[PDB]
Design a protein around this ligand. Structure first.
Ligand SMILES: [Cl-]
Length: 187
């Protein structure tokens, strides 16, 4: 099994593009930009798409234009259209459980209260896809979480997130080939 599709989770709109909830979108935006590739609007698939070369592999980059909580509508339509199985999908998302600068890999598991992930599990009928978890840190109490993810990181956090994005890009050939050693934090 190898990765054919990378979903970058986020909310569409200028007011959301800089927020912590959009770091998945930033990840795919950086891949596209590194490759001199633009996204195309695909309203019938509920997303923006770009196809890029990653050395000797290709992937479809997907930014759902649905808003976070209906991301699965886009992922499901795109997977159906390109004939891609859930195991061949990488979903990149903000992760509260690790700090800005940190990045982990995880196959499957529950949504952990993430609406983007819950929606994808619902539309696919399975949670068994690959996840790239980009740390945004945690505000310290659950009651502050919504506002936290809908806010911009500090200058120092943004720099740390950008670095963690670079780190995931450096591990991308391995990620695409399901070589998932816990070897990101040794970088
Ligand atoms: Cl943090």
């Amino acid at each position: 099994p190898k990765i054919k599709m990378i979903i970058g989770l986020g909310n569409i709109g200028k007011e959301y593009q800089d927020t912590r909830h959009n770091v998945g979108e930033w990840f795919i935006a950086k891949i596209a930009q590194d490759n001199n590739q633009s996204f195309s609007s695909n309203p019938k698939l509920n997303c923006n798409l770009a196809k890029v070369s990653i050395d000797y592999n290709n992937v479809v980059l997907v930014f759902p234009t649905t808003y976070m909580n209906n991301s699965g509508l886009a992922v499901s339509k795109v997977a159906n259209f390109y004939k891609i199985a859930p195991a061949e999908i990488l979903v990149v998302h903000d992760e509260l459980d690790i700090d800005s600068g940190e990045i982990r890999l995880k196959k499957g598991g529950g949504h952990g209260g993430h609406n983007g992930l819950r929606s994808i599990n619902q539309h696919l009928g399975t949670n068994d896809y690959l996840r790239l978890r980009i740390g945004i840190g945690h505000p310290g109490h659950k009651s502050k979480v919504a506002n936290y993810v809908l806010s911009n990181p500090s200058i120092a956090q943004k720099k740390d997130i950008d670095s963690a994005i670079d780190n995931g890009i450096c591990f991308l050939d391995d990620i695409i080939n399901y070589k998932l050693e816990p070897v990101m934090q040794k970088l």
